[PDB]
Amino acid sequence: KAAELIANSLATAGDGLIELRKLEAAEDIAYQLSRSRNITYLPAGQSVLLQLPQ
Amino acid sequence: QVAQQEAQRAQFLVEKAKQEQRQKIVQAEGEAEAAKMLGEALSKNPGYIK
């Protein structure tokens, strides 16, 4: 049914509408195939204490 | 003592084997029927199958 509705919308929507529907679906697939992330990360500094002289 | 434990285990294994076999047949028949049902359901014109 989703097909049916999309097709109807697409038809009214014209060719351009199917085209980009294809693109974002492709977006989804591409994401699916490669779903990963990362973070640059900037490490924090560890600390220690020294006794400063007078 | 040991023998009894062993015997019970043996029965346990066989029974489970039977259960397993039953389950498999049931699934196969289930999918079977599901197939037929889906095919019938396709009565909603070919947009349905698509």
Q: What is the resolution of this structure in A?
A: 16.3
Q: What SS3 class is residue B50?
A: coil
Which experimental method was this entry solved with? Answer: cryo-EM
Answer whether B50's CB lies under 8 Å from A10's CB.
no
* Residue B49 distance to chain A (closest CA, Å): 9
**Chain A / chain B CB contacts < 8 angstroms:** 9
- Calculate ∠ Cα B29-B35-B36, nearest 5°: 95
Return the HEC string of A1-54. Answer: CHHHHHHHHHHHHHHHHHHHHHHHHHHHHHHHHCCCCCCCCCCCCCCCCCCCCC
d(CA B11, CA B17): 10
Contact of B12 with chain A, judged by CB distance below 8 Å, is answered with no
**Chain A positions in Cβ-Cβ contact with residue B41 (cut-off 8 Å):** none
